């Protein structure tokens, strides 16, 4: 009733876009033709998982938040945490005493600093591509760090100026068999910053 993956790979120009269960679809050729375009996105992985989306963590800890640079440059966090720590030591007798007798002028800094941080110190953040899809990971493999290029921490730890000590053995040993398509600049493809290869 439906052909195998070899007939779908021979019929379509992109055999890598053919899925494992795409042959059981009603229109596998149309799905392969739609999946082979330049501006398509894959199905999110939760359709195969029994686990719900971002639900099965249940035991890990995370940092609360990282504020942007202009908000921390206004410095609202310091007296906000000071006010929270002062209110945490207060009693409820003191809480209704302050409720019936308020004390203003707590922060009272200006309007111009927040006006400058909203407008003059406004920085455009880092936004990902149109075809990006967040999943259960997508926060750890940030190397896409090129292969064939040592990191800056490993270059500083081994005393590599910007000549690593193992770069001569890497040049004499040729390309590595794990990444044959990776080209190391300076020794194999004659490299700005710590990324001295691709």
């Amino acid at each position: 009733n439906r052909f195998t993956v070899a007939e779908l790979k021979q019929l379509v120009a992109r055999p890598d876009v053919v899925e494992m269960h795409d042959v059981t679809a009603q229109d596998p050729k149309l799905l392969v033709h739609l999946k082979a375009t330049r501006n398509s996105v894959p199905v999110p992985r939760h359709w195969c998982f029994k686990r719900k989306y971002l639900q099965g963590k249940r035991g890990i800890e995370k940092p609360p938040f990282e504020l942007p640079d202009f908000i921390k440059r206004t410095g609202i966090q310091e007296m906000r945490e000071a006010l929270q720590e002062k209110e945490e030591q207060k009693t409820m007798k003191s809480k209704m005493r302050e409720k019936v007798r308020p004390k203003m002028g707590k922060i009272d800094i200006d309007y111009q600093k927040l006006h400058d941080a909203f407008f003059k110190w406004q920085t455009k953040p880092k936004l990902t591509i149109h075809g990006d899809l967040y999943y259960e990971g997508k926060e750890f493999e940030t190397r896409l760090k090129k292969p064939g290029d040592l990191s800056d921490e490993l270059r500083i730890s081994l005393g590599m100026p910007v000549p690593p000590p193992w770069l001569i053995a890497m040049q004499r040993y040729g390309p590595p068999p794990s990444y044959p398509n990776l080209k190391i600049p300076g020794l194999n493809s004659p490299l700005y910053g710590d990324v001295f290869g691709t």
């Binding site: 249940r58 035991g59 800890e61 995370k62 940092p63 609360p64 409820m92 007798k93 809480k95 209704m96 005493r97 302050e98 409720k99 019936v100 007798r101």
Partner: protein, 84 residues
């Protein structure tokens, strides 16, 4: 009038707290009592989430209330399963 036998009150008091303030004070005191009993019992399975929820790492179970984790003491069979 009997000034020394009236019910006791002090000036600049602010009055009695409402139901919401008393409820959140009771919830904070229950959280403090649960943390005190956890630190007395020295149970390493208790964790606080980044969203602020009780979690049993030995059971891998979230808890809505403090007494939900206080009643999670099954946990012996899950501890024997997670021991190996």
């Amino acid at each position: 009038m009997d000034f020394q036998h009236r019910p006791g009150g002090k000036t600049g008091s602010g009055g009695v707290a409402s139901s919401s303030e008393s409820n959140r004070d009771r919830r904070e005191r229950l959280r403090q009592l649960a943390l005190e009993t956890i630190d007395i019992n020295k149970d390493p399975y208790f964790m606080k989430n980044h969203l602020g929820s009780y979690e049993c790492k030995l059971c891998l179970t979230l808890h809505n209330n403090e007494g939900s984790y206080l009643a999670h003491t099954k946990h012996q069979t899950n501890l024997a399963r997670r021991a190996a």
